[PDB]
Design a binder for this molecule. Structure first.
Ligand SMILES: [Mg+2]
Ligand SMILES: [Zn+2]
Ligand SMILES: [Zn+2]
Lengths: 114, 65, 84, 133, 263, 168, 196, 43, 773, 98
């Protein structure tokens, strides 16, 4: 009855963007990126990788409430280095790592019997 | 009431393995627990699925129109 | 019977029930297009404007305090202290 | 921008009271037979068995968010192997001319005793602790 | 090669036991989930019941028909309804299956997934085919019926994924483990006398060197090595259920960069 | 029993003492006996403790007893409440019971006692002896659909037109 | 509900992605909170899990009949003969990250009955609607579109709160409310008002 | 359905209780909560 | 009674409730289905016009919308039909019945209603699915479980109506219940259980997480606090971050048993400036306890701030315990094998301690204790033996169960279950009973027909030896029934009869409230209390303090409160007072100083004349202990250097303080005299804590500190007064009848049946007793 | 040495309801008394001729499963033929907090 439609877990609705970037005022040079129609799967991941960039002073994320597919990610970096850029890399990094794994996995699979 | 296609918990197909299993009982005369392992059902989740379902349908079928 | 503004004896402070009702009452009016005696810092919720009028003590009301025997004492939102 | 205490002690005993990862320690000083010590310690990242030569230190330096690595090439008053940071709550007067101060690093307590830190030991939160060898 | 490598152990048509090495935990799981819920697949999502006399009620069978796994290898070239410009579906975004049965046999007739019929143009591509792995060759028993019991349907399969419903997911289960000998102490075993004995050992202990008492506690130790094992239903060959995995996940991480751009 | 008391030194100490417990109740006489402290004697039958010692003492008992009924369960209630109740049950004169046979006979208007156990019976004998109702009772107003003199309504609010000028 | 007066309702549904899993692969269908045990002191429920987690593997319809010669020790042996910890617990990894769960969880089958009385058979709202005829107050029951109750007790609280107006409001403007005329002489409804 | 068929009723001196004689004839644990508890029993 | 005193009403909804650890305390999840059904009449105003026309445009089907417009002409425009649906231009003055929206205050409630709190106001938060979703901590007030319990929601209507809900009924205000001058909401289950684990010295948290946790507390200042440990791996202690939720300024000193500002067992509890300094945090620290964390925050920081706290705390903890996992299973109910056998015999040793006495009486060798049958005396011991056994049998398993056993853990946090439970499951069940007398002889001279007549031994009269783990025996089983069955009975009696008592009580005190003169009267005018509570304080503002002046040897008293400026050893050492050396001897001061003492002295006797017990802890307004504690770290008072208070400064301000602690204000004598009275008790405490010596030797206050400590007390007192308006009558009633429902049940009429007796003013009480000294 | 008679089986003191409850000799006496009232609010298969019954209101559980844990007493209560629930893979733990 009140149950939403299943597909509102991944399909953005009328007027929304995967991203929404609001500048955190609590501290200097840091951000709050709201990921729409997304969740842990992509959140936790862009969070870990994002924690390697030695230029990242802070980074955590959270699902505000289970009911809704979406989450907030907060990123902080060293002055003179925009975090938006930091986000970029950390993803590229994630893709590339994957780019390898897609390869190196198939490598081993072709060499198999069964 | 008909076999449950696919396992609740886990997810694995299981709707075909009815007759196969049911046969490993009358003909090949075996004991449950083993029969299952042979049908490929290894973990209790997708295991309990078969071992329990009571095929009422057969009783249903026996009525008329 | 009434009572002089002197010889006054009640509590110098506003009771929760009073304040509670003043704001309400005041909202009600404000919500009814009554005149607003404060600059709306942009507010638009009556009970919120009411909270404002009440902090600049610019609410034109008077709380009549009936006593057990019928006599009353009259205090103004102005006077009454608001701790809470 | 200084240091506030220096000495070496010997572990009289280590105690694990149903705490798989932390044991409280009590040791004595190798100088004034006055300075006794009681300090909780993480016996996982820095093991310690009865009777040893630990070097204790304090000081308030080397309060704004704490920065991660990067300092892989910066200041480092870390020439030790155990460095905690907590606060001091009370300044007791164990009779006579004896003054002891208690410490806590979010859960790990500490007790010190002697009398010459009259002008060394501050009374502020700031108070990094150190240990070596 | 460059980074995160693999060393497939056992491997069949239904499982793919393997070892993921040199990756971040986050990543292992991130993948895992992806495999489970977001791999595009095909399946029935609309049953137009014309006639039924069975003892299973309409929406019952219905549900079942959805679960019944369907072929989906070329899935990646059959647009999702919601995108195909046709008012409510077409050969370019959907597969149609029919179903007819009759109680001719004086002794219980079985309705199996093999009795399905494709009536929409396939456009020449592996898809919409009731997957079978049953010995005999009639997989998944849909429902039975007696004397003159009939059952005329018509189904329409569409894309869809384990988020919109599980009936789509290809996963069906997935082993996952690591640090078989608790070295990072990611747990605190519960016992009565001795953990070691009371808490069984994993076949996966071997592939990693045992403890060695004396040694202090390793703290700088993170998490290399994971012993997965993507199982499978069949809609996809166990491999793709692992490739498309690493793939879909990857595409997402892109649409964030892509969005970071259009912004 | 355990009874704490003023040591000569000042401290408070456990100076136990023997005591007798009855199993019947005749105060007016057990009191006039040699050997007991007719100052600390206590019966739980407040009915009695009130006929002898005197209402005020009675209250003290009624309360004391009631307090024991809430403490025996390990629950705590702030004096004031059981106090108030104990008081209501005692002002009037002696022991007015919280029941149809008591507090529901008091000078309170009709309509209020109406809402409890005798309703019609009570109403009838109201038009009979032509009672008058103040409409100061909570119930009263509730029955009329009027804002009762309660918290929010223990007063009136007015528009002082005078101060309604210096405001502009 | 299980078969031990364990009545409880759903609070949220999750999927295998978010669900806590056990290396084997398996994941739960249910997830009841540990707290519902200590004071209920229903160990039977606790045991059924072990007995079932066993006869789930052996396929030997476990016997949990009344007083018999069975034991917990007698079963932990059978479950051990199968590879899983003898008490039931298992290691599990937090579905969101995939990290291990510091502690272990008592995992395993249990019979659960789905008792009637579901939500969408009770959810009920009303803002004015059918009104009784004798009284002119809202009608009763969710079936007839009726309204809910604000009786003695709920009043007694508003009086407590000292919420004068709100009380009057529930009592009038949101239920009865009626405009009658009187005689300033004989206080009755007699008056013949031709409002026109 | 069965349960309902083996039920017992008892109009209107400590009945509600569980008697010794009640052993083996009537069930000890099966009875309705509150209200008419122990007045309705199951064989 | 069923039409006028209570009615069916409009603008009301009901459904099933469920927990949702993601709502603020004061909120409540309203399902969209209902938010779209329920409506609120807003009046078109320039402030809204726009917003309103939008809702009207939106229609009665989308959510944020409306479903009825009404113009001056008193005509209803039904938004769902009317050919003008999307048309309409609004008009200042018109009203627009719209949908309930995020933040419309509403009255939520759970029947049976018997608390101010059975009904509280919440912030509406429209959510999907179909269930009212309320926060956990606000559970116990409504007294509800989610096992299928339903709740009612009422929606306000007048702009002033709401006002009454948000200003007096909102949950944040209900936090400190007057029915027992202590907080009434706490932290339970997961949050509780979990909050303990996360605390332990043992528990350390690493960066990757610490960071997320921080993020969760919405009011985090974005200042990654400095790690306790930095050495090889920077780590954080649970305590360390849970403290991020705890706001600055707070303070808290505990001291359980073995506590010593180093609490080895990590007992007690001490929080400073809002940072946990030491001590596990559990039920006693963060639950609805007296001197609890909550109790403070509320009375100190604000009602709003304390409500926000539940939020933070929960989120943090919850998210952590979310990964740190937790559970329970049979293994938690089985203790060390030897501990078992050790028990089996501890029971059996108790069987022979019985048998002996069985025969020792089957020979007439037992002294008939006064006032009891030889029989009655036989049983009295028997039971006392078996039970003496049953309990210590438990005390064995209770100690042999490790600090890792889940069940124990839950018992420690205090999140669920208690001792008995452990015993009955793991060790030994117990001796079943009915009316006190162990299972009786229904069957002529024996329990069951499975016994040989005249068998008095325990294994017959109803003693269950096994544990719930082992499993009762047919006989045991049945007895346990008969016995348990008794409960199910009276419970359904102590429920019906309770209901009546509770009601009478109410009807009996409705009309009573505190009137403006500060008197307690009913509907006639009849005074009942001349000062509500014999003190005029609103129960809500009160805490257990200690009247130091009372307890303590006549000796200690002097050494603490006595000051003699005419003596080298009884004067204030100038190391405390600035003008110390120039005081020694001064005779005009020694008189103030001596007045002060001949008073603290009078206070003593006075108190010892009121509270004979010697009990020193009593409920009183204004918590002075804490009022100073703040003064302390608020001016970083150093215990080294000296003060700057003239001895006059002190003694002459403490006096001037009492002067402004007004309760009653009258302009005559008879009144201004009751004044001194209603205060008296307080001042004693007052003069007690603000005694010269104390003020300077214990808490080195400066003039600043002092003059502040003083201001606060006066105003914090003038706050604790009672508001002329409170409908105290009803309150009092409920406050009693309420806990009279939670009553779920050395040989006297006691409890519910008793309370019934009392209120009825019954002449023939079952037990009449009477104690004579 | 007098025993005139002997009980077939003790578990026969129980009645219909109770006979479904597993390990009843392992529960606080009352916990059974409730379960002896919910098993009456459950769903299953009340008969098999339901596809032919016009009774006002009735609930059938799609996929019934005969319980893993059982009681010899069930055999006569015809349980394995018409169950009333499902063997679900339970997990007693704290998670989201729901
Ligand atoms: Mg309930
Ligand atoms: Zn499965
Ligand atoms: Zn199409």
């Amino acid at each position: 009855m009140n149950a939403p439609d299943r597909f509102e877990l991944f399909l953005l609705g009328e007027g929304e963007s995967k991203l929404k970037i609001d500048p955190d005022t609590k501290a200097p040079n840091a951000v709050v990126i709201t990921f729409e129609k997304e969740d842990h799967t992509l959140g936790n991941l862009i969070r870990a990788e994002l924690l390697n960039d030695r230029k990242v002073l802070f980074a955590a994320y959270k699902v505000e409430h289970p009911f809704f597919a979406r989450f907030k990610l907060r990123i902080q970096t060293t002055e003179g280095y925009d975090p938006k850029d930091a986000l970029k890399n950390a993803c590229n990094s994630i893709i590339n790592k994957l780019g390898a794994l897609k390869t190196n996995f198939e490598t081993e699979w072709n060499l198999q019997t069964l | 009431m008909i076999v449950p296609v696919r396992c609740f918990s886990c997810g694995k197909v299981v709707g075909d393995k009815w007759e196969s299993y049911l046969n490993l009982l009358q003909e090949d005369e075996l004991d449950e627990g083993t029969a299952l392992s042979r049908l490929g059902l290894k973990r209790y989740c997708c295991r309990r699925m078969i071992l329990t379902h009571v095929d009422l349908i057969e009783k249903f079928l026996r009525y008329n129109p | 019977k009434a009572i002089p503004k002197d010889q006054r004896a009640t509590t110098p402070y506003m009771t929760k029930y009073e304040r509670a009702r003043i704001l309400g009452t005041r909202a009600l009016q404000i919500s009814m297009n009554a005149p607003v005696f404060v600059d709306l810092e942009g507010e638009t919720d009556p009970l919120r404007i009411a909270m404002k009028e009440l902090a600049e003590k610019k609410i034109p009301l008077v709380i009549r305090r009936y006593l057990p025997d019928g006599s009353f004492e009259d205090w103004s939102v102005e006077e009454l202290i608001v701790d809470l | 921008s200084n240091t506030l205490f220096d000495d070496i002690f010997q572990v009289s005993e280590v105690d694990p009271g149903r705490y798989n990862k932390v044991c409280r320690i009590e040791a004595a000083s190798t100088t004034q037979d006055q300075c006794k010590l009681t300090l909780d310690i993480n016996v996982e990242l820095f093991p310690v068995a009865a009777q040893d030569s630990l070097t204790v230190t304090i000081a308030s330096s080397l309060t704004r968010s704490w920065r991660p690595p990067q300092a892989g090439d910066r200041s480092l008053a870390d020439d030790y192997d155990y460095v905690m940071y907590g606060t001091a709550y009370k300044f007791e007067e164990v009779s006579k001319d004896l003054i002891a101060v208690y410490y806590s690093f979010g859960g790990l307590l500490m007790r010190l005793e002697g009398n010459y830190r009259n002008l060394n030991n501050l009374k502020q939160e700031n108070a990094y602790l150190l240990i070596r060898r | 090669e460059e980074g995160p490598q693999v060393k497939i152990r056992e491997a069949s048509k239904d499982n793919v036991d393997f070892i993921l090495s040199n990756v971040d935990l986050a990543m292992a799981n991130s993948l895992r989930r992806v495999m489970i819920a977001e791999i595009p697949t095909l399946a029935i999502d609309s049953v137009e019941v014309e006639t039924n006399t069975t003892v299973l009620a309409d929406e019952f069978i219905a549900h079942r028909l959805g679960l019944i796994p369907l072929q989906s290898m070329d899935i990646e070239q059959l647009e999702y309804s919601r995108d195909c410009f046709c008012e409510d579906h077409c050969d370019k975004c959907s597969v149609v299956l029919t179903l007819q049965a009759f109680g001719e046999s004086e002794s219980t007739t079985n309705v199996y997934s093999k009795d399905l019929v494709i009536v929409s143009n396939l456009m020449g591509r592996n898809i919409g085919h009731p997957i079978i792995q049953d010995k005999e060759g009639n997989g998944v028993l849909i429902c039975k019926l007696r004397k003159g019991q009939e059952l005329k349907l018509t189904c329409v399969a569409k894309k869809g994924i384990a988020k919109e419903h599980a009936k789509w997911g290809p996963a069906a289960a997935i082993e996952f483990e690591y640090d078989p000998w608790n070295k990072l102490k990611h747990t605190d075993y519960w016992y009565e006398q001795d953990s070691a004995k009371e808490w069984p050992q994993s076949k996966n202990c071997e592939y990693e060197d045992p403890p060695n008492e004396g040694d202090p506690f390793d703290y700088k130790a993170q998490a290399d090595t994971f012993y997965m094992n993507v199982e499978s239903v069949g809609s996809i060959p166990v491999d793709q259920v692992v490739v498309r995995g690493i793939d879909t996940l990857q595409k997402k991480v892109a649409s964030i960069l892509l969005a970071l751009t259009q912004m | 029993y355990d009874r704490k008391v003023p040591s000569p030194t000042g401290e408070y100490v456990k100076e136990p003492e023997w005591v007798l417990e009855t199993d019947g109740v005749n105060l007016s006489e057990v009191m006039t006996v040699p050997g007991i402290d007719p100052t600390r004697i206590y019966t739980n039958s407040f009915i009695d403790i009130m006929e002898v010692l005197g209402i005020e003492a009675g209250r003290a008992a009624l309360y004391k007893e009631v307090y024991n009924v809430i403490a025996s369960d390990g629950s705590y209630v702030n004096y004031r409440h059981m106090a108030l109740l104990v008081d209501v049950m005692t002002t009037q004169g002696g022991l007015t019971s919280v029941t149809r046979h008591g507090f529901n006979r008091s000078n309170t208007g009709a309509l209020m006692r109406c809402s409890f156990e005798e309703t019609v019976e009570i109403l009838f004998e109201a038009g009979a002896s032509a009672e008058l109702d103040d409409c100061r009772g909570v119930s009263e107003n509730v029955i009329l659909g009027q804002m009762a003199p309660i918290g929010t309504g223990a007063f009136d609010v007015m528009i002082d037109e005078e101060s309604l000028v210096k405001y502009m | 509900a299980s078969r031990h007066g364990q009545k409880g309702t759903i609070g949220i549904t999750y999927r295998r992605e978010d669900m806590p899993f056990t290396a084997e692969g398996i994941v739960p269908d249910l997830i009841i909170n540990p707290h519902a045990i200590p004071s209920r002191m229903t160990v039977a429920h606790l045991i059924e899990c072990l007995l079932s987690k066993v006869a789930a593997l052996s396929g030997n319809e476990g016997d949990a009949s009344p007083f018999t010669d069975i034991t917990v020790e007698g079963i932990s042996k059978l479950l051990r003969e199968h590879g899983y910890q003898s008490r039931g617990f298992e290691v599990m990894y937090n579905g969101h990250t995939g990290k291990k769960l510091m502690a272990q969880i008592f995992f395993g089958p249990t019979y659960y009955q789905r008792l009637r009385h579901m939500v969408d058979d009770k959810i009920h709202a009303r803002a004015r609607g059918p009104m009784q005829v004798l009284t002119r107050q809202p009608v009763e029951g969710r079936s007839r579109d009726g309204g809910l109750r604000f009786g003695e007790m709920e009043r007694d609280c508003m009086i407590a709160h000292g919420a004068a107006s709100f009380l009057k409001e529930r009592l009038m403007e949101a239920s009865d409310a009626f405009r009658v005329h009187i005689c300033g002489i004989c206080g009755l409804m007699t008056v013949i008002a031709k409002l026109n | 359905t069965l349960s309902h068929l083996r039920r017992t009723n008892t109009p209107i001196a400590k009945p509600r209780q569980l008697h010794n004689t009640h052993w083996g004839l009537v069930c000890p644990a099966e009875t309705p909560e509150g209200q008419a508890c122990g007045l309705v029993k199951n064989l | 009674r069923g039409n006028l005193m209570g009615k069916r009403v409009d603008f009301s909804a009901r459904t099933v409730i469920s927990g949702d650890p993601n709502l603020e305390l004061d909120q409540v999840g309203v399902p969209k289905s209902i938010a779209k059904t329920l409506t609120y009449p807003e009046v078109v105003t320039p402030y809204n016009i726009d917003r309103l026309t939008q809702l009207v445009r939106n229609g009665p089907n989308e959510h944020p919308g409306a479903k009825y417009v009404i113009r001056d002409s008193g005509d209803r425009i039904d938004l769902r039909y009317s050919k003008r649906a999307g048309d309409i231009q609004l008009q200042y003055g018109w009203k627009v019945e719209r949908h309930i929206m995020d933040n419309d205050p509403v009255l939520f409630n759970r029947q049976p209603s018997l608390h101010k709190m059975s009904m509280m106001a919440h912030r509406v938060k429209v959510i999907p699915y179909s269930t009212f979703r309320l926060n956990l901590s606000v559970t116990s007030p409504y007294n509800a479980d989610f096992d299928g319990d339903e709740m009612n929601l009422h929606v306000p209507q007048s702009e002033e109506t709401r006002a009454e809900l948000s200003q007096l009924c909102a949950v944040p205000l209900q936090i400190v219940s007057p029915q027992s001058n202590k907080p009434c909401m706490g932290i339970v289950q997961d949050t509780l259980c979990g909050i303990r684990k996360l605390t332990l010295r043992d528990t350390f948290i690493e960066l990757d997480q610490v960071l997320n946790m921080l993020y969760w507390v919405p009011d985090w200042d974005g200042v990654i606090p400095t790690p306790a440990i930095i050495k090889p791996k920077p780590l954080w202690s649970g305590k360390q971050i849970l403290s991020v939720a705890i706001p600055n300024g707070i303070h808290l000193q505990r001291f359980d048993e073995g506590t010593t500002l180093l609490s080895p067992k990590d007992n007690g509890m001490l929080i400073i400036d809002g940072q946990i300094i030491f001590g596990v945090v559990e039920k006693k620290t963060v639950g609805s306890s007296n001197g609890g964390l909550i109790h403070v925050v509320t009375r100190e920081k604000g009602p709003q701030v304390c409500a926000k706290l539940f939020g933070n705390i929960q989120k943090v903890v919850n998210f952590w315990l979310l990964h740190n996992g937790f559970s329970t299973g049979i293994g938690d109910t089985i203790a060390d094998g030897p501990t078992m056998r050790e028990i089996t015999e501890t029971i059996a040793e108790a069987k022979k301690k019985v048998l002996d006495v069985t025969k020792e009486a089957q020979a007439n060798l037992l002294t008939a204790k006064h006032g009891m049958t030889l029989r009655e005396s036989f049983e009295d011991n028997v039971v006392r033996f078996l039970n003496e056994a049953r309990d210590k049998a438990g005390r064995l398993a209770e100690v042999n169960l490790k600090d890792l056993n889940n069940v124990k853990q839950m018992v420690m946090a205090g999140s669920k279950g208690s001792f008995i439970n452990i015993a009955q499951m793991s060790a030994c069940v117990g001796q079943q009973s009915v009316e006190g007398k162990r299972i009786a002889f229904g069957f002529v001279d024996r329990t069951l027909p499975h016994f040989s007549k005249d068998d008095y031994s325990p294994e017959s009269k109803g003693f269950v030896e096994n544990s719930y783990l082992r499993g009762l025996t047919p006989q045991e089983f049945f007895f346990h029934a008969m016995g348990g069955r008794e409960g199910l009975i009276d419970t359904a009696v102590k429920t019906a009869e309770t209901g009546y008592i509770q009601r009478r009580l109410v009807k009996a005190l409705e009309d009573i409230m505190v009137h403006y003169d500060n008197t307690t009267r009913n509907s006639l005018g009849n005074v009942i209390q001349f000062i509500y509570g014999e003190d005029g304080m609103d129960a809500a503002h009160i805490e257990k303090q200690s009247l130091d002046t009372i307890g303590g040897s006549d000796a200690a008293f002097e050494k603490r409160y006595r000051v003699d400026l005419l003596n080298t050893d009884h004067t204030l050492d100038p190391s405390l007072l600035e003008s110390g050396s120039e005081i020694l001897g001064d005779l005009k001061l020694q008189v103030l100083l001596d007045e002060e003492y001949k008073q603290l002295v009078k206070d003593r006797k006075f108190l010892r004349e009121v509270f004979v017990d010697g009990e020193a802890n009593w409920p009183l307004p204004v918590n002075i202990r804490r009022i100073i504690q703040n003064a302390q770290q608020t001016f970083h008072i150093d215990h080294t250097k000296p003060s700057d208070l003239t001895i006059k400064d002190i003694v002459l301000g403490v006096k001037d303080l009492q002067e402004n602690l007004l309760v009653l204000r009258g302009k005559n004598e008879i009144i201004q005299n009751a004044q001194r009275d209603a205060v008296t008790l307080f001042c004693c405490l007052l003069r007690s804590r603000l005694a010269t010596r104390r003020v300077l030797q214990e808490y080195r206050l400066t003039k600043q500190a002092f003059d502040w400590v003083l201001s606060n007390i006066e105003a914090q007192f003038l706050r604790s007064v009672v508001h002329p308006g409170e409908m105290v009558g009803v309150l009092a009633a409920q406050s009693i009848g309420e806990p009279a429902t939670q009553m779920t049940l050395k040989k006297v009429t006691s409890g519910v049946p008793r309370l019934k007796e009392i209120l009825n003013v019954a002449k023939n009480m079952k037990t009449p007793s009477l104690t004579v000294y | 040495t007098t025993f005139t008679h002997c009980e077939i089986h003790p578990s026969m003191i129980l009645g219909v309801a109770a006979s479904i409850i597993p390990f009843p000799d392992h529960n606080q006496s009352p916990r059974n008394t409730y379960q002896s009232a919910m098993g009456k609010q459950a769903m299953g298969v009340f008969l098999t001729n339901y596809n032919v019954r016009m009774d006002t209101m009735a609930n059938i559980l799609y996929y019934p499963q005969k319980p893993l844990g059982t009681t010899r007493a069930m055999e006569y209560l015809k349980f394995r033929e018409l169950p009333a629930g499902q063997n679900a893979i339970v997990a007693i733990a704290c998670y989201s907090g729901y």
